[PDB]
Symmetry: C3
Subunit: 221 residues, 3 copies
């Protein structure tokens, strides 16, 4: 029902202890990337946020992070989910530490939230108070600056992004043009922690507004 958290789930986790040079080449790794941590889950944006959190907790870089076509509900195999993430670090111990931080964050209460009675519309509106080394780079901001991480289905996202931008003192960083692989859309916006939180609140409100009135457009503008 509306405002319920949709629980994200990790499906598989593995460590490669001493990456082969052939694999290092195709993943475009640097020489100090000796060990890899592999993870899949059924929620991509939560996992991306968690991978970024891991870079704050351990000496790991996010070296690979991609979503699956048509989302976790359409996975054809058990462990594909809708995301694969790869952390790289100097040793198995450090990669293990990073993976543990990733897992803890995924299970921490973050997640997409339902906008209606049967949870057929959902969105993500997460305030990242202090970015790690992954989301800061992707957003084009200094490490440690804040983001509003906003995701919703295509129309809801475009409508709600506009609402968030008008409501909150933030700047556009990365635009997720619809469709992403999972057929969602959204953006990373930056500003003060306060402004990012305001953007999240306005985004959530606007997505809920569309869910409650999906075809309505005739009112005075």
């Amino acid at each position: 029902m509306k405002n319920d958290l949709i629980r994200p789930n990790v499906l598989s986790v593995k460590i490669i202890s001493n990456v082969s040079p052939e694999m290092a080449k195709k993943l475009e790794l640097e020489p100090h990337h000796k060990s890899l941590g592999l993870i899949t889950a059924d929620c991509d944006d939560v996992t991306y946020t968690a991978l970024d959190e891991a870079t704050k907790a351990a000496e790991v870089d996010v070296v690979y992070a991609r979503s699956m076509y048509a989302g976790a509900g359409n996975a054809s195999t058990k462990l594909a989910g809708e995301v694969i993430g790869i952390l790289a670090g100097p040793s198995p111990a450090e990669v293990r530490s990073g993976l543990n931080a990733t897992l803890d964050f995924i299970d921490s209460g973050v997640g997409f939230v339902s906008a209606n009675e049967d949870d057929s519309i959902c969105y993500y509106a997460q305030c990242v108070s202090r970015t790690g080394s992954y989301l800061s780079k992707t957003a084009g901001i200094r490490e440690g600056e804040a983001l509003a991480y906003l995701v919703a289905p295509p129309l809801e996202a475009m409508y709600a992004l506009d609402a968030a931008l008008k409501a909150a003192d933030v700047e556009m960083c990365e635009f997720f043009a619809p469709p992403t692989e999972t057929n969602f859309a959204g953006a990373l916006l930056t500003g003060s922690q306060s402004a990012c939180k305001a953007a999240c609140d306005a985004f959530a409100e606007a997505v809920q507004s569309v869910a409650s009135n999906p075809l309505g457009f005739l009112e005075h503008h």
Copy 2:
């Protein structure tokens, strides 16, 4: 069943007044674009045709038009359908007028056509007798010129496109290489109205022919294997 029209459905429609400069930039809008009309539906090519109609009815441009991966039957949320379209105009009034024209066209009786008993194969063979700004620009022809808008699943489409091109005095404008996001394929062909209709007729016939006998090759040529 075969030859049934598959009804297309609009899922969501909204307007953005005074688009933010941040969004205007990411959508690569013209400076005079001040308002946006957003629409989603469960059938992409009908919606694209409808958005083209909108550009004839009101002062709007189609500035965004994308299909969803694996089509409407695989949507994971209620309003995603398989298409998002965005109209841009100088005012909410114009965008409103454009959206109303889009909606009316989608519910005008157009749609994909079934090629078999359980509607598990379908195709689109629409003669656009008078293109608006959107499809004419997409096809590289003059506004008002005609198109054959031909869509089918990958193999049917390749087979039927060849049939359509042979049957009619038309020219290739845009090729939809398989897969599009929805795992279909096809093309926009241009020519006289009668030529575009002949291309549509031939395309439809060829798609139905494949649906009726997709593996006739096996008996005719793969015997004794």
Copy 3:
């Protein structure tokens, strides 16, 4: 169940004779490509292997070969499957020969193998002893060289490629970065036929290992 072969199925086959100039141009055909053989199936990598085999069996080139988004189980129509392949040649006779060879190979016993009780995890580990003109190009290697053709779901594939590369003297020529259109991953590896076989065996074992213990790290 585990180690079961997942049968690959062909869904449609058609020929085009005297391809129209307009289609020839959009498909980037060569002047001698007058005829096309079209095929769809519910298993892309088996089909790609079969199309390559066809180039050794007939005077045909693989001119088009693409997978469908989200795989055959998510097809919205009956004949889309998860792959379309197009062979081109000088005559209907040659493209029919090429299609016949493609069909024979698809039915030869090759295919994805299940790694668990409900076949919810599967993989492809096929040694191609002698490449034809299609997989040699995609791999960026010399025609006639051997390949290991390795495919699995994303994490399993990354884990098992590591195991494969360590198991024998092979190079990774083409990386199928996750996701492919079907949400799988893997690679073409090359080396001696014996090394490629060793890589296939190591890949298969590693995928099975992950399936038996998905969360153990």
